[PDB]
Amino acid sequence: QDGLINVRGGQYGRELIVHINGKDVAKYKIPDGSQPEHVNNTDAQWLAEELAKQMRTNLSDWTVNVGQGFIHVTAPSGQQIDSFTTKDGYADQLINPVTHYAQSFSKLPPNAPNGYMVKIVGDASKSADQYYVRYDAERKVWTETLGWN
Amino acid sequence: QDGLINVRGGQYGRELIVHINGKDVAKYKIPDGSQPEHVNNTDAQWLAEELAKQMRTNLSDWTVNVGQGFIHVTAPSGQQIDSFTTKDGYADQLINPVTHYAQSFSKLPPNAPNGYMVKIVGDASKSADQYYVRYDAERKVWTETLGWN
């Protein structure tokens, strides 16, 4: 019942969709560069509201906020974020659907706003258990805290 | 009896084929940039159905699906994916035929959809055995599970 899609510099001609709840939500491709309006377009920040303003129209029952970040999808008590994929168009380094479960400490979202926790799972390279981090911030830092339940 | 070809940003003038069952299947080269239709073309996502729609025409007995991903080739009980290579045109970082056997944890496909297992073989750098991972997701994470048979 929350979790987030960080945006990083969408280049030209890449259809970005968000596949929450099975439906194709937040459809946009960054248009082909002929140049002047397109170079202001290729940033992540203008997309960060352009992707989000369509998700305020579609399924439509919960509120969206973005900071430098992400797109902080968060549902009410009835619905959840099952089948959460988000197509990239370019390689994986374009945008990422990142959730409450990362597979390493290095693969971790930059902002992920203050009330947020990740179950870091083992890297399968060290003999490590599965600790949790909980960004807290006021200061951009991933600590280590208690389990959620 | 499954396994997958991740696509990452095919640049201009690179013939991509998929060599399943010996035959040259899914032939396309990304056309030379003169510019406007070609910059929408150079993405991985438009290729992800363009490569797959030819494999729905050729050998033709099994269904294809793609998510953000890959091309999830999966055969029926009679046929298998023997001689599975997939030409890249650019370097190895363009597209990769990746199967149920990786040689390290770092060399591992990003999505590889939920019902999928990899035999991680030893890196020949540590004194390590050959453990299996089994992506499970709902959460983009490679765990460690039981053997298949």
Side-chain angles (χ1 to χ4, degrees), chain A residues 40-51:
Chain A
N40 198 4
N41 193 335
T42 189
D43 53 354
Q45 185 61 43
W46 188 74
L47 270 66
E49 289 94 8
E50 181 68 28
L51 273 292

Side-chain angles (χ1 to χ4, degrees), chain B residues 4-84:
Chain B
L4 76 160
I5 305 99
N6 49 358
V7 291
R8 291 190 299 272
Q11 292 88 19
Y12 297 153
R14 280 81 184 267
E15 290 90 7
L16 300 180
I17 65 104
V18 183
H19 196 269
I20 296 168
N21 203 1
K23 291 171 93 287
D24 291 330
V25 193
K27 169 64 177 294
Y28 187 72
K29 79 281 289 178
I30 301 99
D32 48 352
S34 179
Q35 66 273 17
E37 291 88 4
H38 302 283
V39 191
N40 198 4
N41 193 335
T42 189
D43 53 354
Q45 185 61 43
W46 188 74
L47 270 66
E49 289 94 8
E50 181 68 28
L51 273 292
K53 68 185 289 184
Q54 188 173 359
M55 284 181 280
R56 292 179 182 176
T57 60
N58 293 319
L59 58 87
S60 74
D61 294 330
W62 55 270
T63 181
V64 190
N65 53 357
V66 291
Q68 166 187 1
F70 44 76
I71 296 164
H72 190 272
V73 170
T74 173
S77 65
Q79 284 73 240
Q80 65 270 16
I81 318 297
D82 289 332
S83 296
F84 179 67

Side-chain angles (χ1 to χ4, degrees), chain A:
Chain A
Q1 292 292 330
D2 47 352
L4 76 160
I5 306 99
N6 49 358
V7 291
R8 291 190 299 272
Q11 292 87 19
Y12 297 153
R14 280 81 184 266
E15 290 90 7
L16 300 180
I17 65 103
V18 183
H19 196 269
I20 296 168
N21 203 1
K23 291 171 93 287
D24 291 330
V25 193
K27 169 64 177 294
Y28 187 72
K29 79 281 289 178
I30 301 99
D32 48 352
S34 178
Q35 66 273 17
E37 291 88 4
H38 302 283
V39 191
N40 198 4
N41 193 335
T42 189
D43 53 354
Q45 185 61 43
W46 188 74
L47 270 66
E49 289 94 8
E50 181 68 28
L51 273 292
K53 68 185 289 184
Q54 188 173 359
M55 284 181 280
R56 292 179 182 177
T57 60
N58 293 319
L59 58 87
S60 74
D61 294 331
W62 55 270
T63 181
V64 190
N65 53 357
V66 291
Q68 166 187 1
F70 44 76
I71 296 164
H72 189 272
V73 170
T74 173
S77 65
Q79 284 74 240
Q80 65 270 17
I81 317 297
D82 289 332
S83 296
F84 179 67
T85 57
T86 301
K87 290 184 191 291
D88 53 353
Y90 184 65
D92 190 75
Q93 63 181 357
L94 200 282
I95 59 172
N96 280 318
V98 286
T99 181
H100 288 281
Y101 300 89
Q103 64 183 356
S104 294
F105 184 77
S106 297
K107 293 181 176 66
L108 193 66
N111 194 4
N114 291 320
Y116 183 76
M117 295 178 69
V118 171
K119 176 169 186 183
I120 297 296
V121 82
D123 202 9
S125 65
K126 290 183 181 180
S127 67
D129 290 332
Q130 299 174 357
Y131 62 95
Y132 303 181
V133 284
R134 189 180 169 84
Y135 189 83
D136 287 326
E138 294 176 354
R139 48 98 187 261
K140 269 69 65 177
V141 153
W142 293 88
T143 59
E144 179 177 357
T145 65
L146 173 57
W148 56 75
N149 198 5

